[PDB]
From a paper:
Perforin‐2 (PFN2, MPEG1) is a key pore‐forming protein in mammalian innate immunity restricting intracellular bacteria proliferation. It forms a membrane‐bound pre‐pore complex that converts to a pore‐forming structure upon acidification; but its mechanism of conformational transition has been debated. PFN2 belongs to the membrane attack complex‐perforin (MACPF) family and shares structural homology with bacterial cholesterol‐dependent cytolysins (CDCs; Gilbert et al, 2013). Distinct from MAC and perforin‐1, PFN2 is a type I transmembrane protein that is expected to be cleaved from its transmembrane anchor during bacterial restriction, releasing from the host membrane an ectodomain consisting of the MACPF and membrane‐binding P2 domain (McCormack & Podack, 2015).
Pore‐forming assemblies were prepared from pre‐pore oligomers pre‐assembled at pH 5.5, in which condition the bulk of the oligomers are complete full rings (Ni et al, 2020), and subsequently by lowering the pH to 3.6–4.0 in the presence of 0.056% Cymal‐6 (Ni et al, 2020). The isolated converted pores exist in two major conformations, a flat ring conformation (68.5%) and a twisted conformation (15.5%; Figs 3 and EV2), both structures comprising 16 mPFN2 subunits. The flat ring pore structure was resolved at an overall resolution ~ 3.0 Å with C2 symmetry, and with local resolutions ranging from 2.7 to 4.7 Å. The ring pore follows C16 symmetry in the top of the MACPF domain, but its symmetry is gradually broken towards the bottom of the β‐barrel. It has an inner diameter of 75 Å at the top of the MACPF domain but a minimum and maximum diameter of 94 Å and 102 Å at the bottom, respectively. 3D variability analysis reveals that the top of the MACPF domain remains largely rigid in organization, presumably due to its large inter‐subunit buried surface area, while the bottom of the β‐barrel varies between circular and elliptical forms. Compared with pre‐pore assemblies, several regions became unresolved, including the epidermal growth factor (EGF)‐like domain bridging the MACPF and P2 domains, and two β‐strands and an α‐helix in the very end of the CTT (residues S600 – I642, yellow in the pre‐pore). A loop between the P2 domain and CTT, which lies along the MACPF domain in pre‐pore oligomers, shifts to interact with its neighboring subunit (residues T581‐L590, red arrow). In addition, the P2 domain rotates ~ 90° around its pseudo‐3‐fold symmetry axis, and its β‐hairpin makes new contacts with the exterior of the β‐barrel now presented by the MACPF domain. The β‐barrel is further stabilized by a molecule of the detergent Cymal‐6, aligned with a strand from the P2 β‐hairpin and whose aliphatic region is packed with a series of hydrophobic residues from the back of the TMH barrel in the MACPF domain.
Numbering used by the authors:
A (entry chain C): 217 to 266
B (entry chain D): 67 to 116
Amino acid sequence: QEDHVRSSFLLDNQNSQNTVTASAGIAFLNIVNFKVETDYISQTSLTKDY
Amino acid sequence: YTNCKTTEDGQYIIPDEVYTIPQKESNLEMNSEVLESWMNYQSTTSLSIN
């Protein structure tokens, strides 16, 4: 009797997360007040098996 | 079947004009193959402006 068993397992995984927050405020002396804030979140994940 | 001839192991009746060589051979071959692939992708973008 002969018996061979071969088991290969490959796992891959990537997570990528970017965050940006840009704020800007011009605040005069109670005449003009202009405030701007932008936000940007990019979250990805990729898992592969075999 | 005049002589009621029998194989030596006593398993079968054979005609008088034949003879049996006992070659009790067995061959087994089992091949199993499993392939499994798993790809998981996940994305999430989020933009905020004020």
